[PDB]
Structures are given as C-alpha cells and as structure tokens.
C-alpha cells in the first residue's frame, strides 16, 4: 500500500490519500457508512463514543476497513501501510492470551479516540504483533487552513511490530517537509532495526531502505506536483514502469519492474523474468484502489475513490486477457477501467 498526506502550498488544504495493494481476487469492494449509537462503557451513563459515525473503504462481510482508510466523525482520518516483521526472534511475542487481534484494536481505537494521542494509547494495548503496520492519524480538528504549524496534534505516527510499538507526533515534520509518505517500510529506526530490515538492505540494497527505495524516490521527486485532489489521484495511481528510471531493478531481467511504482501492476511483469526476490515476480497483485479526502470533504464524511488496478499509463487490467483468467473472481467486472467517483 502507498499513502500520502500532503500540505498544499500556503497551507491551503491538507489532503490524505491511500492506495491499497492487494490480490486481485479481493476486488469486490464496498464503501461503508456506519452511524452507530454506542457508548464508551457498559452503563447508559457513559457518554456516546467519539467515533459513532464513520465512512471507510471495505469488502463484503468485513466489519472494518482492511485497507485501511477511515474518515471518523471525531474529525480524525486513520490509515496505514503494512510493515510486517522479518525478525523470527520476535514471534515469541505473538500469544493467544494477552493479545487482541489487530482488526479489533483498530476498530476500538477508531471508536474511542478524540485525537491522535488517544487513538495511539487505545490501539497499542494488548499489541498482538500481528498485521504490523505504520498507522497515520490525521486530526483535522488541529488543522487550520492557511495557518502556520501548530506544532502538534495534526499528525501522529504509530508503528507496531511484535513486542514493540513506537508513537510520535510528526506535525512539525509534516509542516517542515510539507508531506508524509508511507510505503510499507518503517520510519522509526528502532523499529526498522528490530524487525530485521538492515539484513535485507545488506543483501539486496536500496529496495529495502527507508529513504532510497523506488516509492520513496518517486514521492521525493513528484509529491510537490500534488496541488489539488485530481493531482493527488494521479500520483496515487502512478505507474509508468516501462519508462520511469526509478522503476528499474538493476538485478532483474528485464530491468523495468511494475512493482516499482506508487500503484503496483505485478500482473505486467513477465512470467519468465529473472527476479532476485518474490515481491518482484509476476503476480495477480498490485494497487487496487485509491481513496482521497481533504479538510472539507472529511467534514462532510466524503471522499473521492477509484476502484481497480491503475490504467493511467498502463493497459487496463482484464481478467479474461490476463495470465490469471482461471482464478475465481465471482461478481467482479472482467475489464477494470473505472474512474474516480465522489462517495457518497
């Protein structure tokens, strides 16, 4: 998954976008709006929870996002990209007692949080060490259009691996660089090191580096061109792997690789290619959507959303004309050529 939080020039707006990467067989999609009346505690005297209203991208039968991308009535937007864990010495912290699965912790944090700090406080309890993600919590209540940095509260970043959760307010950093990008690699050095990524950088190079991997470099090169919602959608759908030098994998044959993009199209890599590790293979997997919101859209529990693999500069994915025509995809369109829609 790729995500970008972008402060527009002059602080005019603050856009938040997320592009889920997943297997293509998962592309039955439901955008869900819940309006609940739950209370904070088990007695009628407790206040209503902060997160009773929420809109989120989801799937049939799945009572949370999974992507994840949520716009909460508390004024928060919460989203993540997955970091995983490569250090087998940490699996001992995954236990059935004393651990709540991540999907539950996510739902409970979204319901109770008033702000980024409280979201983190709730979420990190009983850390399961499963679905290990970098979470971004954007608090629009702390965002003033055209205003200077408030120094705190706007952006909180949380990273989870088994046995360790690190949290920091990154508002100053967002205002200094004008963006926060996320692309499946932990930002916190302690988490990067504990989860075994140094060995992978040593073995395979910059693809596993936080600052030098292809998506990091593409965001560094191009994020400033995001000047509005449409520009955000274009970047979040970006894949021009045949022509973009940042998409070259020097260890691969052929060198351009369709995984090395903001919105991956692994189906386009050749089946007989030579690749140094599995993520670079031909796979029925890649970017499968984009959701974008803004200060005003979020206020109205609204987003722009586009479903399916990117076709801006790549040929549209089509099941019957792909290597994957035999996989089950009940209910899905054959050809995926959809444009963004406003939701609701």
């Amino acid at each position: 998954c790729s995500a970008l939080i972008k402060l527009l020039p002059g602080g005019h707006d603050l856009l938040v976008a997320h592009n889920t990467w997943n297997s293509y067989q998962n592309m039955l999609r439901i955008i869900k709006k819940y309006r609940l009346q739950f209370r904070e505690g088990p007695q009628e005297e407790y206040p209503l929870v902060a997160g009773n209203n929420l809109v989120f991208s989801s799937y049939p039968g799945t009572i949370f996002s999974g992507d994840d991308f949520y716009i909460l009535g508390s004024g928060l937007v919460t989203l993540e990209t997955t970091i995983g864990n490569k250090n087998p010495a940490l699996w001992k912290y995954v236990q059935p007692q004393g651990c709540v699965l991540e999907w539950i912790r996510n739902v409970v944090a979204n319901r109770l949080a008033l702000d980024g700090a409280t979201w983190a406080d709730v979420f990190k309890r009983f850390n399961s060490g499963t679905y290990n993600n970098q979470w971004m919590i954007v608090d629009y209540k702390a965002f003033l259009p055209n205003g200077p940095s408030p120094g705190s509260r706007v952006l909180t970043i949380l990273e989870q691996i088994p046995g360790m959760v690190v949290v920091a307010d990154k508002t100053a950093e967002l205002y200094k660089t004008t963006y926060w990008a996320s692309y499946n690699i932990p930002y916190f050095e302690t988490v990067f090191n504990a989860s075994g990524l140094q060995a992978l950088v040593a073995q395979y190079g910059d693809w596993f580096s936080y600052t030098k991997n292809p998506r990091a470099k593409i965001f560094q090169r191009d994020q400033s061109l995001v000047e509005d919602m449409d520009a955000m959608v274009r970047l979040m759908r970006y894949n021009d792997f045949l022509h973009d030098p940042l998409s070259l994998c020097e260890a691969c044959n052929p060198k351009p690789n369709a995984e090395n993009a903001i919105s991956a199209r692994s189906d386009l890599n050749p089946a007989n290619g030579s690749y140094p590790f599995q993520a670079l293979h031909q796979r029925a997997h890649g970017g499968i959507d984009v959701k974008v919101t803004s200060f005003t859209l979020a206020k109205y529990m609204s987003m722009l959303a586009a479903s399916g693999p990117t076709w801006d500069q790549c040929p549209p994915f089509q099941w019957s004309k792909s290597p994957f025509h035999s996989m089950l995809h009940m209910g899905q369109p054959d050809l995926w050529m959809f444009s963004p829609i406003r939701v609701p």
């Binding site: 998954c1 889920t20 990467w21 997943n22 297997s23 067989q25 998962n26 592309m27 999609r29 439901i30 955008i31 869900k32 819940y34 309006r35 609940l36 009346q37 739950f38 209370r39 904070e40 505690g41 088990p42 989801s58 799937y59 049939p60 039968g61 799945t62 009572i63 949370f64 999974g66 992507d67 997955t82 995983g84 087998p88 995954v94 059935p96 651990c99 709540v100 699965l101 991540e102 999907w103 539950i104 739902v107 409970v108 109770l112 709730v122 309890r125 399961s128 499963t130 679905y131 993600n133 499946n184 995984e259 959303a305 479903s307 399916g308 089950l328 209910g331 369109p333 959809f338 609701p344």
Partner: protein, 180 residues
C-alpha cells in the same frame, strides 16, 4: 441493484426479526446499492437505534449488514478464503495450530469480559465481537442474541476479518495479501 432491511425487536415475543424496507423504529437498518458493474464499488449505509442498548445495537448491525449483502459475502468468500484450512488441507499441522491459537484467543477475550464487566475497553471489544456474531448468525439464517458469553467460530466469518493478522500468524505458527 439496491436492497434495504431492518431488524426489529418484537417486544411481545422478544424475538428479533428482519423486515424489508426502512423501519426507523427497528434496532438497526441498512441499505446496499451495488454499483460494481458501473463504478467498481458497492455502497452500504447502516444505522443503529440509540433507544436500544449498545450490545443489541452491535449484534443488530452485524445482522442487517449480512442481510443486505449476502450475495456479495458468498462471492467474496469463494474468491478469497474458501480453500483456507479446508477439509482437504495438506498443512494439517499448521491448520490445527491456527485453530488452537484462535480458539484460545477468543476464549481469553470472553474470560476478560466476564472478569471485567465494568471496563470500557472490554465493553468496546465485546461490541466488536457481537457485530461479528450477528453478521455470521444472519448469514446462516438463525438469530440468537447473547446476553453473556458466546462462541465465535475460529474459521467462520472471523477469517474475513483476520486476513491482515494472518500475514504474521502464518510465520509465527511456522507455516510453510495486503502489502508489497
């Protein structure tokens, strides 16, 4: 393309029952518009009624969601997890470990709820699991609202919720999705 359903509580019998259409007196209602052919998305709008306690609202939310999306649930199940730890699975070792892990984790949560009836945290966990129970019960066509402990099936609709958790449970349980 569109379907609306409400879950009523018959105070007479104390029975929950689904009705077609919008009944703002109900415990919950939902409507689903399937625009997948046109836009690649379906849209679900779901509400619960604050006149009922939140436990019943949560269970009802699961029920009405399943009620308007049954076709989509079936297809998504077939597309994504129908073979996962099935009756013919070769990795019987892993599947047994997974099942044991999930059953113990679910039991541990049920115990914490029983041991902490005044905890806000465990109240929120219980609401989440009630919604999951209502989703599965409604899909199976038989409603039973629990007032105390309840058993979530480890490899039922829980499997639709744990796809991300499984990315780590697999290696953690030494087995031989979303992300890069």
């Amino acid at each position: 393309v569109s379907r609306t359903r409400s879950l009523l509580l018959d105070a007479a019998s104390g029975q929950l029952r689904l009705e077609d259409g919008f009944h703002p007196d109900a415990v919950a209602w939902a409507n689903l518009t399937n625009a997948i052919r046109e836009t690649g998305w379906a849209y679900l709008d779901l509400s619960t009624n604050g006149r009922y306690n939140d436990s019943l609202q949560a269970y009802a939310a699961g029920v009405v969601e399943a009620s308007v999306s049954e076709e989509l649930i079936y297809m998504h199940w077939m597309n994504t997890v129908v073979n996962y730890c099935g009756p013919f699975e070769y990795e019987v070792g892993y599947c047994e470990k997974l099942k044991n892990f999930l059953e113990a984790n679910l039991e541990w949560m049920q115990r914490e709820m029983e041991l902490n009836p005044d905890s806000p945290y465990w109240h929120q966990v219980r609401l989440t699991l009630l919604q999951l129970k209502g989703l599965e019960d409604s899909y199976e066509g038989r409603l039973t609202f629990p007032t105390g402990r309840f058993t979530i099936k480890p490899l039922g609709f829980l499997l639709l919720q744990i796809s991300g958790d499984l990315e780590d449970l697999e290696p953690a349980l030494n087995k031989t999705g979303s992300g890069s």
